[PDB]
């Protein structure tokens, strides 16, 4: 069971990660940035190419 998230707090401006994920990654008018809305909105080798866009990154996976 490996589940993650990410840090919407430190995304810009961009989609590079909602494109590699239109379903867990989208950002929010509450959180004016993207965030995983849904861990299981998208897959975890989206969720990878994913992570590999952004450029600080800013996501995470989470254990357990
Ligand atoms: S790739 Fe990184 S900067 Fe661009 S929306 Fe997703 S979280 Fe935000």
């Known amino acids: 069971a490996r589940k993650f ?3 919407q707090d430190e995304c810009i401006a961009c989609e590079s990660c909602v494109e590699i994920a239109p379903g867990a990654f989208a950002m929010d008018p509450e959180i004016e940035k993207a965030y995983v809305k849904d861990v ?12 590999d866009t952004c450029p600080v990154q ?7």
């Not at 800013?58 to 357990?64: A, G, K, Q, T």
């Open 40 to 51: 299981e909105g998208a897959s975890q080798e989206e969720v990878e190419e994913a992570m």
């Open 5 to 7: 998230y990410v840090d």
């Open 58 to 64: 800013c996501i995470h996976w989470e254990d357990e």
